[PDB]
Structures are given as structure tokens and as C-alpha cells.
Amino acid sequence: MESLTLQPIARVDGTINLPGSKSVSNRALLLAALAHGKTVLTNLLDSDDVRHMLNALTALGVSYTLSADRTRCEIIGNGGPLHAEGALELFLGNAGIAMRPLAAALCLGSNDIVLTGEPRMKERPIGHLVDALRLGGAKITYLEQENYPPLRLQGGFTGGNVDVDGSVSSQFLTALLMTAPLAPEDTVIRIKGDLVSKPYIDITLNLMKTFGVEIENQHYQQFVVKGGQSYQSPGTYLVEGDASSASYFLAAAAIKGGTVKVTGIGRNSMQGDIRFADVLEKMGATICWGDDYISCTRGELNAIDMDMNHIPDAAMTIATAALFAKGTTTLRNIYNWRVKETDRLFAMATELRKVGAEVEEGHDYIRITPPEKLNFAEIATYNDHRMAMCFSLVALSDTPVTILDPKCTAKTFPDYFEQLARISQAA
Numbered sequence: 001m002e003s004l005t006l007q008p009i010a011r012v013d014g015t016i017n018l019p020g021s022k023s024v025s026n027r028a029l030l031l032a033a034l035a036h037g038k039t040v041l042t043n044l045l046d047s048d049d050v051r052h053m054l055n056a057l058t059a060l061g062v063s064y065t066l067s068a069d070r071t072r073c074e075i076i077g078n079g080g081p082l083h084a085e086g087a088l089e090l091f092l093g094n095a096g097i098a099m100r101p102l103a104a105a106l107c108l109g110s111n112d113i114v115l116t117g118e119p120r121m122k123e124r125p126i127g128h129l130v131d132a133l134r135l136g137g138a139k140i141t142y143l144e145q146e147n148y149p150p151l152r153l154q155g156g157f158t159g160g161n162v163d164v165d166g167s168v169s170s171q172f173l174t175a176l177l178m179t180a181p182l183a184p185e186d187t188v189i190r191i192k193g194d195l196v197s198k199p200y201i202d203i204t205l206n207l208m209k210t211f212g213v214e215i216e217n218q219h220y221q222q223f224v225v226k227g228g229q230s231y232q233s234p235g236t237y238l239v240e241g242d243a244s245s246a247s248y249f250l251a252a253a254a255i256k257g258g259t260v261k262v263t264g265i266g267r268n269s270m271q272g273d274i275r276f277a278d279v280l281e282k283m284g285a286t287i288c289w290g291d292d293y294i295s296c297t298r299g300e301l302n303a304i305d306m307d308m309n310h311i312p313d314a315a316m317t318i319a320t321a322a323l324f325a326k327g328t329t330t331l332r333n334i335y336n337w338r339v340k341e342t343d344r345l346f347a348m349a350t351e352l353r354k355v356g357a358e359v360e361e362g363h364d365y366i367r368i369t370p371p372e373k374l375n376f377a378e379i380a381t382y383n384d385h386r387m388a389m390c391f392s393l394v395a396l397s398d399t400p401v402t403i404l405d406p407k408c409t410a411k412t413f414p415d416y417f418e419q420l421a422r423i424s425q426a427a
């Protein structure tokens, strides 16, 4: 078992040029592949999730080239739905934003493709999306456990009236939204009840528009899509820096700064996780906004009690930042933490207790009461990049922390530890 031990960090201060957004990267790659024309993506993220999408595109016959650092990609658009037969197997690691979007997109026309991934991916739900795709005409078979990958896709999505449950993942709706425009018939997507992670739907619509397609959003309850459309290359497109990856650095300043500035995202960003900065502000930190940066300067840090459904990923960073706050922090309406890279409510509660916190693991919330002082712990990371990055913050105390399997950060941020070190100061 690999591990990394982080020495106590006395202060953080500096600037970080963010790696590209995973959410934007995978959407841009899939849309560029489906579009007509050549798209040049810059500031693309090089991480496992994007690599799996790139490999999938290669396997489907899409032609593209990558720069030496894998952040510039010149994609030759396919000019329409992607195709493959012979039950071609596409391995997608544990990348939900590759798995969900491709499960929908590859239902267009005829195909015989199998989508699979790591063991955990075979335990992450996809039934709500399969249900919707089938209502639209798709033929989809569960090869193992019903409602989970792996899936054998044999095509047939033509459009029509499609209901979709948006209560567990917004990715199912995102997948439908990107696929529907290319279907032969018009599609009316009706959300069954609640819609979680709503800001990600805005990222999807933003990218679709960049690639030439707009739809009718009726207060996020129903989306009217015209079929027979075509995506078009936007030419050169700059992938925003990752706002979720930025959370660790901004939180580090809130706890132990100093001022930390992250570049690549700013006040105009489409990512909902830039709202993480508003949470740090509510806790007592000072935030500065720019056109291409966000910075955080140490102020004070007070506990908060907030519904975090709008920033589920960056919300994990508040869970460990809470170790340094005054009072008990409560993060609510985050049930789907349970169905992501690992069951994050169980994992976060378990590891937080190891460093001394008293934690109530609620069914869909977590309540954290920090200890007077933290103690050393060897942190399990559950094959979850964010468990490793969130717990790295424990080192902003008088105690070191050992992080197991630190390379798990590669899912979205391979260079995480070197970047944290960049802003770590001895004085």
C-alpha cells in the first residue's frame, strides 16, 4: 500500500494555476467528437476521468492529437453519432461523466457497445438513465446487476416523451440533454420530482450552446428538444480551470493563510463550485474575485449549518475544513455522496473520527464537532481522489497526517500534492 505523509504546514500563501475542469473537459470532448469540424480544446484536464473519455473516443474511431502535456487537444469531429459494433467494450474507470453521457449518446442509431469500468462503477446507479433512454426507444441490457453498469447498448433512441428521475444524479438528465438534439424526433424530457446538483445542468446547457445547440428549459421541470440537429465545432475553446480542484487551496488559505489565489476560474465561471468561495466567506474568510481568478485570505473560521446540494463535491472540503472551525458544522441534503466514488458520508465520518472529531453520520447529512486538538491518523482513501485531497488539509495543524494511496488523486488532479506543496510555507 503506497502512502504519503504530510508534515505540518505553518502557513499557506501563493498562486495556483488550476488544472482544467473535469466536468467541462469530458463534455467538450464528447461534443467535439459528435460535432462537424475540428475543435481545438486548450487547458484540457489530464486525469484518469478524461483519459478514459479519450480512450473511448479512440476506440470509437475518433481522430485527435494531444500536446505534450495533454492539455491541448485537436479533435476531428465525426459529424454525427459515434458508432461501433461487435459488443466493443469501452472501459471507463470510475468516470461518471464519461459513463453517463456515453451511455446515452451511444444509443443513437444502431450500435453494439458495452460500457464497463472499475468494480466501484459497477456499484454506482444508472437505472434512472436507462429507464429514460428506453422510454425513448433505446435497447439496453444490464450485463450484471440490474440498474448498474456494465451495459450493453444496442441503439434505437429516437426521441419522444421521456421521463427522467433527477433525484439521485443530475448526470442522467445531462446525458439525455446532450443526446436528444441528434435524435431523429423531437424529445420532451420531463423531470419526475426533485432535481439534485442543479448547477451541473447549467454547465451542460452552456457547453451544448457553445457547440451550436439550444433547447427550451421550462423551469428545470421539463426540457423541450428539437431533433435532427447537428453539433458544430466552436473553433478554439478554452476549458475553465477546475473549481472543485480549487476548493482545497482556497480552504487552505481560510484555515492557515496568508492569501491563496487560484487562476483559471473567476466571477464569470459556469461551474457551480465557485460558490464554494461563498461558503468560506460565510465562515469568516475574505474572498477576492477577478475575471480570471478567485482568492481567499485568512480571516476567521466559524462553523456553518448549510444545505450543500448545489456544491456536493466542493462540500467535502468544508467537512475537513470544519476541523478548524469554531463550533459544530452541519452539511445537509447531500445524500448522493453515498453513490459516488465511495459512500462519502460513511467514509468522511469514519476518517474524521480518526483525527479526533465527534461526528454524526446522518442519512443525508453530516454533523462535525471538532476536537480541541487533532491527532495523527493514517487516512484511508477509498479509491476516492477527494478523500485524499480533503484530508491533506489536516496537515494545516500541529500534526502530520499520512494519506494512503495518494495517487488516487489522479482521478481529477494528478499533481495535487505538488501543487499543495507550492503554496505551503515554513514561515
Ligand SMILES: O=C(O)C1=C[C@@H](OP(=O)(O)O)[C@@H](O)[C@H](O)C1
Binding pocket: 022, 023, 024, 097, 168, 169, 170, 171, 174, 196, 197, 200, 312, 313, 336
Ligand atoms: O455533471 C458533472 O460534471 C458532475 C455532476 C455531479 O454528479 P451528481 O449529479 O450525481 O451529483 C458531480 O458530483 C460530478 O463530479 C460531476
Ligand SMILES: O=C(O)CNCP(=O)(O)O
Binding pocket: 094, 095, 096, 097, 171, 313, 340, 341, 386, 412
Ligand atoms: O468528482 C467528484 O467529487 C465526484 N464525481 C463523480 P463522477 O465519477 O464524476 O460521476
